Design a protein around this ligand. Structure first.
Ligand SMILES: C=C(C)[C@H]1CN[C@H](C(=O)O)[C@H]1CC(=O)O
Ligand SMILES: C=C(C)[C@H]1CN[C@H](C(=O)O)[C@H]1CC(=O)O
Ligand SMILES: [Cl-]
Ligand SMILES: [Cl-]
Ligand SMILES: [Cl-]
Ligand SMILES: [Cl-]
Ligand SMILES: [Li+]
Ligand SMILES: [Li+]
Lengths: 254, 254
């Protein structure tokens, strides 16, 4: 049987391809995650049908404890795999079986160039520069749950004023950084992508934490361990490195 | 239960403690991995007995395909867990079930400071400076199996002349870098530890690959997923970062 793959539009992982006519099926899409799925399919010998997650969410819980997003598609067996920049977190790993990571990353800061800001601590100890994250994503959750003093202080700020410092999506965050005195807490792989395309922006400081993106599968899936072993082969062959360079290299920023 | 844990002496992961009299049982040991085991046991509620792997090996295959080391202890169900800087590789993941990584790293180069050498390509394109790796470790295996031209060239060099450029263990590699015109291919977390303590050594270049250390379990173990989840909790709480700082920080370099 052909596997159903849940995913989400997110540059440069999954994008609509450009054409002169309406597109259908897997031909709608291109990006790093499409290349990853062609390599996984090459090694493992499955066919697949890519399906955008109907609610347009990655996966978090509502106040009843019920999941949404790609994570919920896997829980409910409406997808076999999720292939997206789906952060491997404690809360999600309890409810789905993630492969080992195909990409490693951490939270960092996207801000304008030319300023004296150098770290999260520099942001935490002040209130003139606003800062926030995408609402309900794993970066926001990291701040919400942290018991590290600096990160607790930052969460107090971000959550204040009915969460006015948060944004609904990364593109909104990026425009806010570009327009106003605002720093976005963002996963470092996305910061790399953005700062190679907008030379007025930069990463501030290093990575705050360390985590990965993995392919999601339902708990008990026979595909999880097969996909992990395929990812390790692709990593060791230098294929994942090549695929990242293909999709991230920009017009170049100093 | 009391779980049986196979491990290996490797600084700063597992070391003999210092004391005036004979030590016994788990009290023989300290280091990053003993701290990790303590935190895992706190979260999961198991007792454990630490046992050094009798052959003193991590786990590789002989000419006949037979495994040794900690990996073989797990295959044979002589241990429940392997807790060590045991690299998660394609060949090992086919025969045991690794947790997700508790530490992320890559192969890099250990060399003396103050030379023109800046990358693997600089070593690969010459034959005066000798370079190699620990024989039969995952770094050597990476080079043996690579089809990337630079790394094939390096493997041809490392393996030439009855593998005279290889070393038996990391300590031997470090002494050879300190004394002679030699560069060691070494996992980056070990390079960090060594360069904190040898102010005349440095990492050359970046990481050539990306991988992790995981807790090994036999295929099918119920503990594997539980330990993954505990690791993710420890990462998100900042505890893994604190543990690394504790064991890696040196006395400073002038
Ligand atoms: C693009 C977004 C909304 C996703 C991507 N990975 C994170 C996740 O899987 O939650 C989210 C980003 C973040 O929270 O910074
Ligand atoms: C200390 C050594 C022999 C081990 C540690 N991790 C690698 C492994 O698990 O094979 C080896 C290092 C290396 O191959 O550079
Ligand atoms: Cl649910
Ligand atoms: Cl022992
Ligand atoms: Cl896993
Ligand atoms: Cl000699
Ligand atoms: Li899971
Ligand atoms: Li495995």
């Amino acid at each position: 049987r052909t596997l159903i793959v849940t995913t989400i539009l997110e540059e440069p992982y999954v994008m609509y391809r450009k054409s002169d006519k309406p597109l259908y099926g897997n031909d709608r899409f291109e990006g790093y995650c499409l290349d990853l799925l062609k390599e996984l399919s090459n090694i493992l010998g499955f066919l697949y049908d890519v399906k955008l997650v109907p609610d347009g969410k990655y996966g978090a819980q509502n106040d009843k404890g019920e999941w949404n997003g790609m994570v919920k598609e896997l829980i409910d067996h409406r997808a076999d795999l999720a292939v997206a920049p789906l952060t491997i977190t404690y809360v999600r790993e309890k409810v789905i079986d993630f492969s080992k990571p195909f990409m490693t990353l951490g939270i960092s800061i996207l801000y304008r160039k030319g300023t004296p800001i150098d770290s999260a601590d520099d942001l935490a100890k002040q209130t003139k520069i606003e800062y926030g994250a995408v609402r309900d994503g794993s970066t926001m959750t990291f701040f919400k749950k942290s018991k590290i003093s600096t990160y607790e202080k930052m969460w107090a700020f971000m959550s204040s004023r009915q969460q006015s410092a948060l944004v609904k999506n990364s593109d909104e965050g990026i425009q806010r950084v570009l327009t106003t005195d605002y720093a976005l807490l963002m996963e470092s792989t996305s910061i790399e992508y953005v700062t190679q395309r907008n030379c007025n922006l930069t990463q501030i400081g290093g990575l705050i934490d360390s985590k990965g993106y993995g392919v999601g599968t339902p708990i008990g899936s026979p595909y999880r361990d097969k996909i992990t072993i395929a990812i390790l082969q692709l990593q060791e062959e230098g294929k994942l490195h090549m695929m990242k360079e293909k999709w991230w290299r920009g017009n170049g920023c100093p």
